[PDB]
């Protein structure tokens, strides 16, 4: 078999419920990117921007798979550090040449994590011809999107030279964008009630446990959001979904309301008026259906 295998998980559900789950997953499950990047030294043949844009999208979940939950709740961060020079043999850079650290985010502890050996067979950059007289080296560090760079965290970087880091960070800090940057861990769709996950399975860890952690996080968040959903029962301001009992008309203007009412017989779009009886909505029934769907999803995942 291969180090990486592409797989699919398919489940059949009520169309509105499948859409609800898909949109919830895309809105709530956010894996941070390595967009806080500082180049400390660069005498290679590639400019800083190429290195930084490439490193921003390292697939890090296959390394930090033991800390998924806390990473998804943003109680824990991570960083990567690279320092590599030309060599006579193996004159290239793999993902095994990095060092990976986890950040507690409460005590600001920085701790090293284990590296799978399969990472030795990945490729990032190939050096030019080796010349002893001249130098050809790269050194850089990158933090995940939500991290705050202050003296407290900097004091823990005992593997670096703090003066160089301070200088280069002061150089680059102005172009780092301030908002949170993330990716979706895998691809999720639901064409006509057919909920499908396109995922990648690696040889060195069990994918089912990681999938279960993600699904549990999603289910908890979705139930919490459902419990706190309110529909204004006054007049329509054309900005939020609302219900007029005088006319008995519902103005649908958000996705959760759309999916819930469609689950109970409506056929609405995202900015539309409809004649719907609000007494037909039963939140507990919807929550029970969601829980059953999550159990079914986990069962489908188990049979890979």
């Amino acid at each position: 078999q291969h180090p990486r295998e592409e797989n699919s998980i398919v489940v059949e559900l009520e169309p509105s419920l499948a859409t609800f789950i898909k949109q919830g997953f895309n809105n709530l499950v956010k894996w941070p990117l390595l967009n806080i990047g500082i180049v400390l030294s660069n005498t290679s043949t590639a400019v800083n921007e190429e290195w930084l844009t490439a490193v921003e999208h390292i697939p890090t979940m296959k390394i930090f798979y033991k800390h998924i939950h806390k990473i998804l709740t943003r109680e824990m961060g991570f960083l990567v550090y690279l320092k590599r020079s030309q060599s006579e043999r193996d004159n290239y850079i793999t993902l095994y040449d990095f060092d990976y650290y986890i950040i507690d985010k409460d005590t600001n502890s920085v701790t090293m994590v284990d590296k799978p050996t399969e990472l030795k067979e990945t490729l990032l950059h190939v050096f030019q011809e080796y010349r002893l007289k001249s130098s050809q080296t790269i050194e850089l560090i990158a933090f995940s999107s939500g991290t705050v760079i202050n003296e407290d965290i900097v004091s823990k970087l005992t593997f670096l030279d703090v003066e160089v880091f301070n200088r280069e960070y002061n150089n680059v800090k102005t172009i780092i964008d301030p908002d949170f940057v993330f990716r979706s861990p895998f691809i999720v769709i639901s064409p006509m009630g057919k909920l499908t996950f396109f995922v990648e399975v690696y040889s060195w860890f069990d994918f089912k446990s990681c999938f279960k952690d993600i699904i549990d996080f999603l289910e908890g968040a979705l139930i919490a959001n459902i419990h706190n959903h309110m529909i204004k029962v006054g007049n329509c301001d054309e900005t939020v979904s609302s219900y007029n009992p005088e006319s008995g008309m519902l103005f649908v203007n958000d996705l959760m309301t759309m999916n819930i009412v469609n689950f109970f017989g409506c056929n609405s779009r995202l900015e539309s008026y409809h004649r719907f009886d609000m007494t037909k909505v039963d939140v507990e029934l919807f929550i029970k259906a969601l829980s059953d769907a999550c159990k079914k999803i986990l069962s489908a995942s188990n049979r890979l």
């Binding site: 169309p15 499948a18 859409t19 898909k22 949109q23 895309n26 990117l33 180049v39 043949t45 400019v47 800083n48 921007e49 190429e50 844009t53 490439a54 921003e56 999208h57 280069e168 150089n171 680059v172 102005t174 172009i175 940057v181 990716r183 979706s184 691809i187 999720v188 769709i189 639901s190 064409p191 006509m192 009630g193 499908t196 396109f198 996705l255 779009r269 995202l270």
Partner: protein, 702 residues
């Protein structure tokens, strides 16, 4: 010519002109400067003799030959009555290094004369401005001749000896014969009854290397002017042609050539199989009978075949190297071909191997890809190897009525991951008096400077920062950075002399934003109208969302048919990208195609059948035609009908929004009239012209 004017070569015909190359400029300047030098020496000696005695030669007149200023002016862009021979290289694209040195310029004629066909590219000409119809591009098979003086003399001697030896008794008619000229110099007069033989035997001997030169031109003019012309001089346009001899295509009577071709070069073919190919110049071409294609030749009867002297190569060899970047131009409207040639030279590429060394302006592509639906010329010239775009997934549909009038939709995650990312690099230069540079006083504009008075490496400069200390003595008089976007300092070079010279190279990466400009290889250009999130885009059954959405109507109203064929072939390649031997196999779709659409469809069908042997007829048809069902992400339901959907090589153009934006609140004035000054880099104001004034009066707003 008095009685039949239209049958005599026109003054705008290429038959009566020759072309100057790089070395000829230098040769002419050397000639003129040497003559001026000798003239000045003579005048000085004469004046010295007139005033003084002994014929004394003054010094300071025999130490300045004047070649230095002549050459400097030449490179500056002045040459006799022309001012366009040389220019500063604009570093837009790699292919420009081919495009510009293969251009031919004409003195101020704008109509497309027939004599330009087959030797110049039909579609590569300026589309607007003062140069419209005045600059042409050589075809990939055309060349301009060179020859040395000694070679010239030897060739002329051999030709004259041949004439005087093999035709001793029939070269002194002078009353009813055909005059024979070499470079317009009359040397004999041939008996009319023997004209044909003389030409045929000549050409044969030309192809065997008898005269020591394979590019000699011989023309037989017979309408009623009755001349035989021989041309050997430099500056002539020449191409290879297939030989037809006595109604017989020689290529078809050389069985060994087919087996031996793979191991031979062009000169080997000329040496070992003469009479298969002949080098022909434009004047000889204009007076010959040439069959347009081998296929057309094979369909004629022998008597018909006997009327022809040459046969032509396929049409793809009649385009230039720039037009060879396009696909299937003969399946589209011609105006689109002109536009496509214009915008191909503005596509961002792997400009230079010295990106980190050269201190110059430039734009560089970041994660390049090599095109795989190409022509042979694009491969031999190395334009393909240096890349000018990326393969992206497109859909042809209307997206909520947003992508209208050439606007496009682009995906946010595609941009985030590096899709069609570029880097712009700029050069800055200043000269400073030594006292000002060493002057010891911190102004707010010096925040990026080091203790040595120079900007720090890897710092980002803003719109008010200085690059080097320049104080006039207690006032700051330094130049300032004046771009609306920041840039990183990549390199600094300093020269210390009576003055201080500082050169700085800066770089900035520029991910696509609203207003940036893109295009395809069929001239479908547009700007970014909306950046859409991945969750807002329609998707197919495999979960794929398009990177770019283009409105479909413009494909059919402008009749750019070859875009659809390009998408079909790119998908076919993606299904099966390798040979039976497992080697990477590009697909050949030349400009001036000549291959049927049905053959391409069959090739695509074979690729898909190799990929997945078990496909239904409907699925196979959908794959061949690149049609898919897409789903609305808001409701997860299919659209009414299937959508054209697939990959294509997409180009980014050098027109960026933040390079054009301008705004002024208040600023400097001109001294004489006391009105707002001009210049984007100097904070000038926009001009309110008199046509705008007309409009305001038409509104009645006094």
């Amino acid at each position: 010519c008095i009685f039949h004017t239209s049958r005599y070569p026109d003054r705008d015909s290429m038959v009566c002109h020759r072309i100057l190359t790089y070395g000829k400029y230098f040769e002419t300047l050397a000639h003129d400067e040497l003559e001026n030098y000798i003239g000045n020496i003579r005048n000085d000696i004469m004046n010295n003799h007139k005033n003084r005695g002994t014929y004394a030669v003054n010094i300071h007149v025999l130490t300045t030959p004047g070649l230095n200023h002549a050459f400097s002016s030449l490179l500056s862009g002045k040459f006799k009555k022309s001012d366009g021979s040389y220019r500063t290289h604009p570093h837009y694209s790699w292919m420009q290094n081919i495009s510009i040195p293969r251009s031919v310029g004409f003195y101020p004629v704008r109509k497309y004369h027939p004599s330009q066909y087959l030797y110049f590219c039909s579609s590569d000409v300026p589309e607007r401005g003062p140069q419209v119809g005045l600059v042409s591009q050589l075809s990939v098979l055309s060349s301009i001749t060179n020859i040395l003086t000694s070679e010239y003399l030897d060739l002329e001697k051999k030709i004259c000896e041949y004439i005087r030896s093999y035709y001793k008794d029939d070269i002194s008619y002078f009353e009813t014969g055909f005059p024979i000229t070499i470079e317009n110099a009359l040397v004999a007069s041939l008996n009319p009854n023997m004209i044909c033989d003389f030409v045929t035997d000549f050409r044969r001997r030309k192809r065997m290397g008898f005269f020591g030169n394979l590019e000699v031109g011989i023309t037989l003019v017979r309408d009623h002017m009755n001349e035989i012309r021989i041309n050997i001089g430099a500056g002539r346009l020449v191409r290879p042609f297939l030989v037809v001899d006595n109604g017989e295509l020689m290529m078809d009577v050389c069985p060994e050539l087919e087996s031996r071709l793979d191991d031979m070069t062009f000169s080997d073919i000329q040496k070992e199989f003469p009479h298969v190919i002949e080098m022909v110049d434009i004047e000889q071409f204009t007076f010959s009978n040439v069959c347009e294609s081998v296929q057309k030749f094979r369909m004629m009867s022998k008597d018909e075949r006997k009327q022809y002297d040459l046969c032509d190569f396929p049409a793809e060899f009649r385009d230039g190297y720039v037009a060879s970047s396009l696909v299937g131009i003969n399946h589209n409207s011609g105006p689109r071909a002109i536009l496509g040639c214009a915008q191909a030279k503005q596509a961002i590429s792997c400009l230079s191997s010295d990106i980190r060394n050269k201190i110059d302006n430039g734009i560089h592509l970041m994660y390049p890809e090599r095109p795989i639906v190409i022509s042979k010329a694009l491969e031999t010239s190395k334009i393909a190897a240096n890349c000018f775009g990326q393969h992206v997934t497109i859909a042809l549909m209307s997206y909520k009525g947003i992508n209208q009038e050439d606007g496009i939709i682009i995906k946010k995650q595609f941009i985030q991951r590096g899709g069609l990312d570029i880097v712009t690099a700029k050069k800055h230069q200043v000269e400073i008096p030594l006292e000002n540079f060493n002057n010891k006083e911190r102004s707010n504009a010096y925040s990026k400077l080091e203790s040595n008075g120079l900007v720090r490496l890897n710092a980002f400069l803003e719109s008010g920062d200085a690059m080097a200390r320049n104080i006039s003595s207690s006032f700051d008089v330094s130049e300032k950075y004046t771009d609306m976007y920041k840039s990183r300092v990549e390199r600094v070079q300093v020269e210390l002399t009576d003055k201080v010279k500082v050169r700085v190279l800066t770089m900035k990466e520029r991910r696509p934003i609203l207003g940036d400009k893109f295009t395809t290889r069929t001239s479908q250009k547009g700007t970014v109208a909306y950046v859409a999130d991945e969750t807002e885009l329609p998707y197919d059954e495999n979960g794929i969302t398009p990177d770019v959405i283009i409105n479909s109507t413009s494909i059919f109203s402008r009749k750019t048919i070859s875009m659809l064929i390009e998408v079909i072939l790119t998908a076919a390649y993606s299904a099966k990208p390798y040979n039976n031997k497992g080697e990477n196999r590009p697909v050949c779709f030349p400009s001036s195609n000549e291959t049927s659409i049905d053959t391409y469809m069959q090739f695509a069908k074979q690729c898909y059948e190799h990929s997945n042997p078990k496909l239904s007829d409907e699925e196979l048809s959908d794959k061949i035609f690149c049609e898919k069902i897409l789903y609305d992400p808001e409701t997860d339901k299919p659209y009414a009908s299937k959508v054209f959907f697939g990959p294509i090589y997409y180009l980014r153009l050098r027109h960026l929004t933040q390079d054009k934006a301008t705004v002024r609140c208040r600023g400097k004035k001109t001294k004489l009239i006391r009105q707002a000054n001009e210049g984007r880099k100097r904070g000038g104001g926009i001009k309110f012209g008199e046509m705008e004034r007309d409009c305001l009066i038409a509104h009645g707003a006094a």
